[PDB]
Amino acid sequence: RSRKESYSIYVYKVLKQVHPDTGISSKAMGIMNSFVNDIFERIAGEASRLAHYNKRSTITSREIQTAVRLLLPGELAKHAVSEGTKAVTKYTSAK
């Protein structure tokens, strides 16, 4: 049938990773999916605007990092950049 995608299973996995003995209602899972989509849209729009400012055809990790820096507040942006750099290096070190 209509096989439409969402983030519900990933949000649930993350929840069980942080809070094992805690569930989530369906309306809150909907809100979290909307939140993820919103933040994705904000970051991608900022990255696109930056790429077009700098005359580049590619969205790399530098654009994503600087869009994160532009969008999130200080400590939050710092932690997010730390996480992203950690993940990128761990993915690049292996193959």
Binding site: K27, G30, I31, S34, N37, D38
Partner: protein
């Protein structure tokens, strides 16, 4: 149909907003403000619907119309 927003409902909305005493003209003022807000939002939604060549107003039209105003709403499929 604008009379359907009764005085107790406006009182309830003001009490959840922390308001302790209410004038008598606040009700008409609030009805006018709500009418303006709803007029703008429904106009945007109907624009979206007409563009999509539909006769039914969906929840996506309302969500995009609120995103257009800057009133982003979570929990309706956004």
């Amino acid at each position: 149909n604008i009379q359907g927003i009764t005085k107790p409902a406006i009182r309830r909305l003001a009490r959840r907003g922390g308001v302790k005493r209410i004038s008598g003209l606040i009700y008409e003022e609030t009805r006018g403000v709500l009418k303006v807000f709803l007029e703008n939002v429904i106009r945007d939604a109907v624009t979206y619907t007409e563009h999509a060549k539909r006769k039914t107003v969906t929840a996506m039209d309302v969500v995009y119309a609120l995103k257009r105003q800057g009133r982003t709403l979570y929990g309706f499929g956004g």
